[PDB]
Structure 1
Amino acid sequence: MIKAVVFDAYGTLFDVQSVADATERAYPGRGEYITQVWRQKQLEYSWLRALMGRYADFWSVTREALAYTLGTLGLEPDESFLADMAQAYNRLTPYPDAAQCLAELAPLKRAILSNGAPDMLQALVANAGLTDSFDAVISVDAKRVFKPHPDSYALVEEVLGVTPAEVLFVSSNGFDVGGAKNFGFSVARVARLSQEALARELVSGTIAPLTMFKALRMREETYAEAPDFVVPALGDLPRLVRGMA
């Protein structure tokens, strides 16, 4: 039976677009651009560092990705500036119905499995006021890999003591849904962007920057095994788990 609900962090429980106000500062007029590329490169760098066998924690990844992004704009900020701005990733606003969701899931074990480095995750959850909502906040850092590497998902059993079959994994990220499924978890994908809306947006005339990234990041990935469930919001999870098993 489902004994634990384990959540992806960035993009699932926390809004990675909420760095917008801060990025709009590093380049007025380019906040949206920066937000999108920063996130895209954060992901790419986590995958590429892991696949090369050259791990560095998510804090290093986040700053390298920011440096790349600002560099495309012709900037060359120093490490101090990068470290200060990157703190935006430790203050992402949780999704509105995150709190209520975790609450209604109080009976079950509740955890996070994230690429985020140990200190990033504590700040992020604390700042979101959700520290008391998790029995464990698990960082991939100990394994020195990034999702979707199987060793990342292995941590759930190592920490919670439950087997893959007894875990409901939750993510808004297609590649993470894929990695969780490959590992053996049941998965609930959070799909906040309706496929039909994206399709029409993509033909609504000239394709805007933001549309490109939605197109790259907010769909199920074709190589991946389908999630067991798809809900439009975290709030639908408790009711999903009720009439589930």
Structure 2
Amino acid sequence: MIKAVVFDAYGTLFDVQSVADATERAYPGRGEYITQVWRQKQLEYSWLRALMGRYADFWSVTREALAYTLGTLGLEPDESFLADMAQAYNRLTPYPDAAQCLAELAPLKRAILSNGAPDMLQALVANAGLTDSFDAVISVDAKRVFKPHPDSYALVEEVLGVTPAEVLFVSSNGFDVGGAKNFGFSVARVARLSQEALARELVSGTIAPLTMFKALRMREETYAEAPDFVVPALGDLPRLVRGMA
């Protein structure tokens, strides 16, 4: 039986597009571009540092990815500027139905498992006023790996004392859905982009940037095990757990 619902953070509970106005200031006219490449490179760097055996926490990864992104535009921001702007990732707006979802999921154990560094996750959760909606906010930092490395998911039992079989893992990120399934969790994927809409979008003449991010990041990955469940939004999870049991 499901005893805990563990949430991915970035892209699942929190909207990574919401750094929009901060990036638009870093380079007027190019906010959309920066938003997308920043997120993409942030993910790539977490995978590559881990795979290379050169871990650095998500705060370093986030700043390195921002530096790369602004670099493509010909900028050369200093550490002070980078540390300042990267704070936008600790202010991400929660999806509008997150709070209600989490409230209805009580008394089940509720937690976050995220690539985010400890201080990042605490600030992000605090800013969103969701601190008391979680029994635990788990960072991969203790294991010095990033998802989808199995050690990241091993943390859930260590912290919550529930077995993988008793966990419903929730994520909008295909690679995270894959890593959680690989580890042994039941998984509910949050799919906000209908496949059919993307397909037609990619056929409608010139292809835009956000569309590029969407094509690369909003689908199930072909190498991964399929999620047990797919829902359109977080608010659907309470109903899923009920009609599930």
Scaled to the shorter chain, the TM-score interval is: over 0.9
Percent identity between the two aligned chains: 100
Residues in 1 aligned to 2:161 and 2:43: alpha-carbon distance in whole angstroms: 28
Residues in 1 aligned to 2:242 and 2:126: alpha-carbon distance in whole angstroms: 28
The alignment of Structure 1 onto Structure 2 pairs a total of residues equal to 245
How far 1:209 moved relative to its partner? 1.0
Q: Secondary structure at the match of 2:219?
A: coil
How far 1:154 moved relative to its partner? 0.1
Cα root mean square deviation, aligned: 0.3
2:65 matched to 1:65?
A: yes
Deviations 1:18-55 (A, max 9, x none): 00000000000000000000000000000000000000
Q: Secondary structure at the match of 1:81?
A: helix
Residues in 2 aligned to 1:143 and 1:191: alpha-carbon distance in whole angstroms: 28
Residues in 1 aligned to 2:221 and 2:210: alpha-carbon distance in whole angstroms: 19
Residues in 2 aligned to 1:200 and 1:131: alpha-carbon distance in whole angstroms: 40
Deviations 1:116-166 (A, max 9, x none): 000000000000000010000000000000000000000000000000000
How far 1:90 moved relative to its partner? 0.0
How far 1:9 moved relative to its partner? 0.1
Residues in 2 aligned to 1:186 and 1:9: alpha-carbon distance in whole angstroms: 17
Q: Secondary structure at the match of 2:18?
A: coil
Residues in 2 aligned to 1:182 and 1:82: alpha-carbon distance in whole angstroms: 35
Q: Secondary structure at the match of 2:112?
A: strand
Deviations 1:67-115 (A, max 9, x none): 0000000000000000000000000000000000000001100000000
Residues in 2 aligned to 1:112 and 1:34: alpha-carbon distance in whole angstroms: 26
Residues in 1 aligned to 2:2 and 2:144: alpha-carbon distance in whole angstroms: 28
How far 1:204 moved relative to its partner? 1.0
Moved over 3 A (4+): none
Q: Secondary structure at the match of 2:169?
A: strand
TM-score with structure 1 length normalisation? Answer: 1.00
TM-score with structure 2 length normalisation? Answer: 1.00
> What are structure 2's unaligned runs of at least 5 residues?
none
Residues in 1 aligned to 2:182 and 2:110: alpha-carbon distance in whole angstroms: 21
Residues in 2 aligned to 1:226 and 1:14: alpha-carbon distance in whole angstroms: 23
> What are structure 1's unaligned runs of at least 5 residues?
none
Residues in 2 aligned to 1:162 and 1:193: alpha-carbon distance in whole angstroms: 32
